[PDB]
Design a protein around this nucleic acid. Structure first.
Lengths: 107, 147, 64, 99
RNA sequence: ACCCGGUGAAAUUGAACUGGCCGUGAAGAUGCGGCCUACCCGUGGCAGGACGAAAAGACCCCGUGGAGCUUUACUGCAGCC
RNA sequence: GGAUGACCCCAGGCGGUAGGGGAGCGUUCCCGAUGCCGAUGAAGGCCGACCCGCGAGGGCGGCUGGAGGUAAGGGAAGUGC
RNA sequence: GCUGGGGCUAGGAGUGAAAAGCUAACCGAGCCCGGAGAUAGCUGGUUCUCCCCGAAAUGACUUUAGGGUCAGCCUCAGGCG
RNA sequence: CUGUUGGGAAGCAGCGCCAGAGAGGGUGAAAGCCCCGUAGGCGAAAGGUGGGGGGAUAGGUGAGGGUACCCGAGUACCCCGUGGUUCGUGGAGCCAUGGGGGAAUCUGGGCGGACCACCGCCUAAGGCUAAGUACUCCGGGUGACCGAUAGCGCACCAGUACCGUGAGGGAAAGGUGAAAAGAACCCCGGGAGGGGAGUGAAAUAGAGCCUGAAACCGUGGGCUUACAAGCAGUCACGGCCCCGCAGGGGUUGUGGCGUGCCUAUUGAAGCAUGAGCCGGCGACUCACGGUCGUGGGCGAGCUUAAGCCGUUGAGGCGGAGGCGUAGGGAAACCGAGUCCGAACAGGGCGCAAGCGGGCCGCGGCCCGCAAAGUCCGCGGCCGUGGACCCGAAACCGGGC
RNA sequence: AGAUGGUAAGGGCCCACGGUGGAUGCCUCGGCACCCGAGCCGAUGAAGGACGUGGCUACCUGCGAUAAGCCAGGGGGAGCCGGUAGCGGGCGUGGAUCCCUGGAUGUCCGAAUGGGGGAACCCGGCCGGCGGGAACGCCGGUCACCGCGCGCGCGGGGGGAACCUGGGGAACUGAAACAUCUCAGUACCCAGAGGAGAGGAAAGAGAAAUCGACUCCCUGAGUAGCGGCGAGCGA
C-alpha cells in the first residue's frame, strides 16, 4: 500500500542536504521502492562503460544518482520558498498539496 | 535526595556465594562438595534417612488417637484469653469485640482465664476458669455466661 | 511446592512449648512379663530426645 | 516512603503547593508562562501533580516536567524529580493516603 | 620397495632442546643422582624401548546396575479343570 | 594515642588440600539517561620499557577501527574455562 | 536343485533341516519417535583475585562395607570470662 | 533557517519557533521543528461481527374444597465382582455398575460414613442451558529477552541440502559503500590473477568485500647456534644489536639451580587419567515451602490472597485468610497450670518480663528507649522438582 | 709451542610486514517471552499438494486452460507492468500499479465420492454440444457410501498448533532391593466436540434452627484423613 512520497516528478525542489546542499532542480524521476529521487544536474557520477555498440570508444558517462527523498524539498511557485507540504480539501472536493507559509497550491 | 543517593544499608544487600568458578575464589573445582559420593553428585533426605538402619523416628511407637475416616469430629472449641489481656477495654467485653482486636481467633468459643488483674468489667464469655471467676466476682466484674 | 508434614512423625511425637521433642519410651509393646514393675512404670513416661535428632524431627513438622 | 519522600523534598524548599493554575487551559506555552511566574524555568526538573487534566496536558510534553494525577503519587517519581509541585486538591489526597 | 616429474592421505600427537650404565624414585627413568658417552641434519633399512597405537579390560571383583535362560524360589497372569 | 575508618606509633600473627569465613575485580543488562562522551573518532582490535592497584584489574599514549559508547551511586544475572 | 517376477508372516512376534541363526552392514529380543533431562550410592568435569582459619581418613549402627545418620575433628556469629 | 568543521551535519555556533506532538525510527554523523511518524482527531459502498440499544414473537401467572388417578424399571433395593472419593477392606457409607435376585408412586423413595431409633435434608432412574474458565496456528502491543556457536531446527529459497527402504533424522550458510560511483582504457597472461588508470572520505571497504583476534604458513631484519646432555625455565655475569646522552629493551655464551599441567591418590615427573594447537559454546539456577542469619517496617500485634479501581512502566483498595497472643493431656477436659496418681507425695511438660527519666500528693502512670511477634528485602543451607553438568546397559508406549 | 675469532646446511628468540582463519565489537530482514485481540475450515470439494501459467523464465512469489491474472464496489493520487536488471514491447490525473470487499475463473490429486489405482494416472454409464462424425475423440452436465425424514430431499465423511471431553492406558523411576504402594489415570492410542470444551438448577451439601445450580480463582490446608501408618498420597 504505496510508499508515502511528499514529492513528484516533475515539480521543482531544493536539495536541503548533502553535497548539493542548496542546488535546485525539477524532479526527473521518482522511485518509491527506493524512497529516492532523481533531480536534474544533481548527484552526478562518473560511470565507466565498456566498449559496445552505443559507446564505441567506451570510457565514462555521467548520470544523476538518486537522492534519498528526505533530502529533497519542494519549492512552492508562490513564495519561491522551499516548504513543507500541507493538504487542503477543495470544494471539488479533491485533495491537493499546499504551501506551508503561503497557501499556494503545489499541485 | 535524588536517585544516585538511594542506597541500601551495610549488609542489607550481600553478594551471592558463586562456587565452581576458579581456584582463587575458594570455592573452585569440587565446589565446596569435597570428593566423590552421593552429596557431591547432583541429588538423600537427611532429616529422616539414616543408612538402611531402622530410623530414629520409626523405632519410636505411636501415641493416642489418630482419628479415622470420615475424619475429625466437629465439637465446639475454646480459646482462653487472660484477664491481663482484658486490660485495654472499658465497659462491656464480648467475644465479638475480642476478635476484632486480635485476641480471640475466629470460630472459637471464648473462655476467660486466670493470669492478670480482674477489671470491674462486664465480660460475656462462653466459659470461665475457676480463679478467673473468683477474681472477677471480687473486683466487681460482671461475668455474664452465654451459650 | 509447600513441604508436607511427615505423618509418621506427627503420629508419634510432640514438639513442646520450649522447642524440645518429646516421645514415648520404647520397650514395653510386648515381652512384658518378667519385666520389673520398675521398668514398665518408667517406660510409661514421655521423654526428651537427644538434641541432635530432635532438630531433624522438628523440620519434618514445619506447621506445628 | 511517600511520606518521607515528600518530607525530604519539602525540607529543601523544593516543595511548592498551588491554589490553581492561572490561565493554563491546555496549551503547553500556556503552562510555560505560569511556571516562569512561579520560579519554574526548567533549570530544575518537576514532578507536577494535579487531578487537573488540562494542566497535565500542558505540562506533559515538557522534557523537564514529569506529570501525574494525585492517586499516582509515588516515591520514585518524586526522587527522580528535583522539584515537587502539587495542587491543594492533590495535597489533600496525599495527606489522606498517609492517614 | 628405491630414484625423477605429477596428484597426495592416515590413525597419533601435553609440550620437547627425547643418549648409555648403575643407582634411585609409586616397586621396570631420555626427563632424578653419579659416572660414561656424544660435532650439526638427513636417506634406506630392523624392530629391542618409548610400560609404543587401537579399543574408558571381554578375565577378576565391586553396583542393594542390566538382560537372556531355569526351577519343586516368590507373587501373579494366560490357559485348562 | 584520635575520638568511631584519619592516620601515626608499638607489639604480635600471617605453609596449607578437603573446607569455613571475609574483602574485592571484571562481563551482560536497568535506574541515573529528553542526560554525558563521540567523526577534532564509539565499541572492538594491535602495541607500550609509562602511571595506579597486593592482586583480579584500571588508566594514559601510539596504530587500527569508522558508530557507537555510557559515569558517581545503586539494581538484576544465560557472569569469568 | 538353482532362479526372475508377483505375494504373505515381525518385535516377546515372525521365520528357523536348530546356529539363540536370520528379521535392511553389531539381534539373548529390529528400527524410529515418544515417556525422557528414566535411574547412575559410579567415572569425568566444574571457569576471576586477595585476606583470615583450617580438617578427616576414627567410633556406633547400617542388604553396610569405595554410600550413608549420629558422634569426633574444621570454620563463622552471638554469649560466658 | 543561517553560519561553521566535514565526503556528508542532525555535531559546534547565532538568532528563532512548535509542543494534547520531546514515543520511535530514518535521512551521508548526533534532527521536537527535513522525512515516516508521534499527541489529538476523522473514516466504509461492500463483507464479517454484533454479549451493547431497541422492537417483535415463543413462552409464562391464582386460591381453597374434595378424589388418591400420575409423579421417569430390569430402575430403586439387597447380594457377588469393581471403579470413583482422602478413603489401600478398613467400623466403609456415599457415587458409578459387569452378575443374580427384584419393589413401590408421596402412609412413596434416597441421604446425613456399618446398623437401629429419633430428628433433619433431598426428590433417582429423560433432556437443554449462556457467562465467569483453558489454549494460542493467527493479528497486534511490550521486554533489567537473544543478537548469527546466541535466538526457533530455519534471520539466507529449511523441514531444504544431505542421511535412511521407511517411520524418521537433519545441517551449514547474515554485513562493500552514503551512493555501484562494481574499477572504462592500457600493460603481463590461454584464462585466473596482477600492475597502472579511474571511482571513493576511506579500496589490507574490490565483491574470496565492516571490524579482521588466535592457532597455522611465509618474507625480510637483529641477536644466536655445528665438543653438546634436555619439563627448556630461573639467577648471575659477560658479549653483540637497539632506544636513549649512572637507565632501559632484544638476544644468549658461561656458571648456579630446577621431576610439565590436570585428575586420581597413602603416594605421580612419573612408564597411572585427560589433553594436537587455537578460537568460540560449556556446569550450584529457578519456583514454592522450610530453617538460621540479616537490613528494614510495625509491634500485642503483624500481615493480606484472589480480586476490584486506577495507571498505561502510578499506585491504591481488598481482613477472606495466615502467623503470634497459653499450655498440658490420647482424649473428655482443665488452664498459669496441666498429665500420671487415691495424694492436698514425687515427677514430666509448662508459667514470672524490659531499661529508663521525669511530673505528683512509694509507684499512681505516664512518657520515651528497647523487645515478644510478624511482614518485606537480602544472604547461607534444607525439602520438593532434571536441582551442578555430561554419560549408560536397559524398561515401557505408539508407529516403520 | 699457545690462545682467540669469522663461517649457518639448517634451527632458536625477538622485531616488522603479510598470508591463512573468522574470533571480537557494532548491526539486524529473524527469533523468544508475556499481554491483548481474534478463533474454525470442508461435498458450493477443505487442509495439503501435483502439473501448469510470463514475449525471452532456473527458482521463489502470485495466479489456474479467463492462469504474476477477469468483472464490480470502496480506498488512494503519480506512478506502473512481483522478487529483476536487461533484451523487446506497453499502461497511467478521460486516475493505472497498489490495498480492502464482493464476484467470476479455478486443470489434475487429495475425505475424493462414477469406476479402478502404484496420490496428481487409467477407464466407464446416462443426457446435451462439437467434427464428415455411426465407429473415434474432445467439451458441458450428471452418477460413491452411510444416517435420517416424506425415488426425492436434508445431514455426515476430511482437516485444525495447542486447549477440551470421553473410551482405553504403560514403564523408567520413588520406595536407597521389591510384589501392595509410587511415577499416574501421567505418556501414549482412539472417538467426539468446538471456538471453547466439560459441568450445570440438588434423590446437593452436613450440623449452622445453616447453605441453595454449574464452572473458575484465593483461602480452608499440606488441615481432615489415606498409607507395606513405609515411600508417600491428599480432600
Amino acid at each position: 500500500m504505496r510508499v508515502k512520497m511528499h514529492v513528484k516528478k516533475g515539480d521543482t525542489v531544493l536539495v536541503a542536504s548533502g553535497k548539493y546542499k542548496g542546488r535546485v532542480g525539477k524532479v526527473k524521476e521518482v522511485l518509491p521502492k527506493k524512497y529516492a529521487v532523481i533531480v536534474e544536474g544533481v548527484n552526478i557520477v562518473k560511470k565507466a562503460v565498456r566498449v559496445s555498440p552505443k559507446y564505441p570508444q567506451g570510457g565514462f558517462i555521467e548520470k544523476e544518482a538518486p537522492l534519498h527523498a528526505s533530502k529533497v524539498r519542494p519549492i512552492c511557485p508562490a513564495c519561491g520558498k522551499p516548504t513543507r507540504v500541507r493538504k487542503k480539501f477543495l470544494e471539488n472536493g479533491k485533495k491537493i498539496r499546499v504551501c506551508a507559509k503561503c497557501g499556494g497550491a503545489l499541485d | 535526595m535524588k536517585l544516585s543517593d538511594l542506597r541500601p544499608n551495610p549488609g542489607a544487600n550481600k553478594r551471592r556465594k558463586r562456587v565452581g568458578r576458579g581456584p582463587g575464589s575458594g570455592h573452585g573445582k569440587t565446589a565446596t562438595r569435597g570428593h566423590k559420593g552421593q552429596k557431591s553428585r547432583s541429588g538423600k533426605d537427611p532429616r529422616r534417612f539414616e543408612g538402611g538402619r531402622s530410623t530414629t523416628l520409626m523405632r519410636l511407637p505411636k501415641r493416642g488417637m489418630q482419628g479415622q475416616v470420615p475424619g475429625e469430629i466437629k465439637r465446639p472449641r475454646y480459646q482462653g484469653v487472660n484477664l491481663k489481656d482484658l486490660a485495654r477495654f472499658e465497659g462491656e467485653v464480648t467475644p465479638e469485640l475480642l476478635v476484632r482486636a486480635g485476641l480471640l481467633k475466629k470460630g472459637y468459643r471464648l473462655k476467660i482465664l486466670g493470669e492478670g488483674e480482674a477489671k470491674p468489667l462486664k465480660v460475656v464469655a462462653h466459659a470461665f476458669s475457676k480463679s478467673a471467676l473468683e477474681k472477677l466476682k471480687a473486683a466487681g466484674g460482671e461475668p455474664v455466661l452465654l451459650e | 511446592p509447600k513441604m508436607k508434614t511427615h505423618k509418621g512423625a506427627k503420629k508419634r511425637v510432640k514438639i513442646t512449648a520450649s522447642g524440645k521433642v518429646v516421645a514415648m519410651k520404647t520397650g514395653k509393646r510386648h515381652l512384658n512379663w518378667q519385666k520389673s514393675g520398675k521398668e514398665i512404670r518408667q517406660k510409661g513416661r514421655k521423654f526428651v530426645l537427644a538434641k541432635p535428632e530432635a532438630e531433624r524431627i522438628k523440620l519434618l513438622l514445619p506447621y506445628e | 516512603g511517600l511520606a518521607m519522600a515528600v518530607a525530604d523534598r519539602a525540607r529543601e524548599g523544593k516543595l511548592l503547593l498551588v491554589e490553581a493554575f492561572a490561565g493554563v487551559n491546555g496549551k503547553t506555552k500556556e503552562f510555560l508562562a505560569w511556571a516562569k511566574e512561579a520560579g519554574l524555568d526548567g533549570s530544575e526538573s518537576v514532578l507536577l501533580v494535579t487531578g487537573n487534566e488540562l494542566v497535565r496536558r500542558a505540562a506533559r510534553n515538557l522534557p523537564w516536567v514529569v506529570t501525574l494525577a494525585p492517586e499516582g503519587l509515588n516515591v520514585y517519581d518524586i526522587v527522580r524529580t528535583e522539584r515537587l509541585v502539587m495542587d491543594l486538591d492533590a495535597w489533600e489526597v496525599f495527606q489522606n493516603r498517609i492517614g
